[PDB]
């Protein structure tokens, strides 16, 4: 977050656009949001059977 804060304001224009967009997702996670390690799976839920009968 802090890295991106600096990355955002301090470099000149034409750059920090993507730092803004990147910040969005980081903030999203650190808001009432979760931990990004679950973004990948190692447990797969199976849908019930009658829903795929």
């Amino acid at each position: 977050e802090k890295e991106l804060l600096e990355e955002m304001k301090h470099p000149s224009r034409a750059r920090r656009a993507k730092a803004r967009k990147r910040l969005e997702v980081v903030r999203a996670f650190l808001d009432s949001g979760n931990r990004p390690e679950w973004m990948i799976l190692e447990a797969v839920p199976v849908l019930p059977p009658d829903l795929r009968p």
Binding site: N34, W38, L41, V44, P45, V46, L47, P48, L51
Partner: peptide, 13 residues
């Protein structure tokens, strides 16, 4: 309930 579980089948809480 169906849209809860059907949503849970992709790893959404």
């Amino acid at each position: 309930r169906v849209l809860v579980k059907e949503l849970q089948a992709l790893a959404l809480d």
